[PDB]
Write a protein that binds this ligand. Structure first.
Ligand code: CL
Ligand code: CL
Ligand code: CL
Ligand code: CL
Ligand code: NA
Ligand code: RH3
Ligand code: RH3
Ligand code: RH3
Ligand code: RH3
Ligand code: RH3
Ligand code: RH3
Ligand code: RH3
Ligand code: RH3
Ligand code: RH3
Ligand code: RH3
Length: 129
């Protein structure tokens, strides 16, 4: 599913991402835009053989099992395919674990390079939140 911007904002808010670990909703929407273009089915192979999955491009190196990332972990205790669902629950729950792990949203390289220090509030402007 390809979310609308405000549609995704509303779902992220309902699932408790607004101000989670101090990150305002616009941070999460901006991250999703540049990670996946709001597409839950987005996948991307990393150089090390791991793969990023879903609207927040969660990596199989640490967070989910895809059966083809040798030596990797599954810290969210989910198949990576769960991260491709039209329902964003699994991605949100796993994102909460990632953002809590020490480096905050710097875990998402696209957030660090394209969202951090920008006017992220712009990403939720106009939405009935
Ligand atoms: Cl947009
Ligand atoms: Cl914001
Ligand atoms: Cl694996
Ligand atoms: Cl932080
Ligand atoms: Na894994
Ligand atoms: Rh808010
Ligand atoms: Rh708030
Ligand atoms: Rh990657
Ligand atoms: Rh890499
Ligand atoms: Rh496995
Ligand atoms: Rh397996
Ligand atoms: Rh399995
Ligand atoms: Rh649901
Ligand atoms: Rh839902
Ligand atoms: Rh502004």
């Amino acid at each position: 599913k390809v979310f609308g911007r405000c549609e995704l904002a509303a779902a992220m808010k309902r699932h408790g991402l607004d101000n989670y670990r101090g990150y305002s909703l616009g941070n999460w929407v901006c991250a999703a835009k540049f990670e996946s273009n709001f597409n839950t089915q987005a996948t991307n192979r990393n150089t090390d053989g791991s793969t990023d999955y879903g609207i927040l491009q969660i990596n199989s190196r640490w967070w989910c099992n895809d059966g083809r990332t040798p030596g990797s972990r599954n810290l969210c205790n989910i198949p990576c395919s769960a991260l491709l669902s039209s329902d964003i629950t699994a991605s949100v729950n796993c994102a909460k674990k990632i953002v809590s792990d020490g480096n905050g949203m710097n875990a998402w390289v696209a957030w660090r390079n394209r969202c951090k220090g920008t006017d992220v509030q712009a990403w939720i402007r106009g939405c009935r939140l």
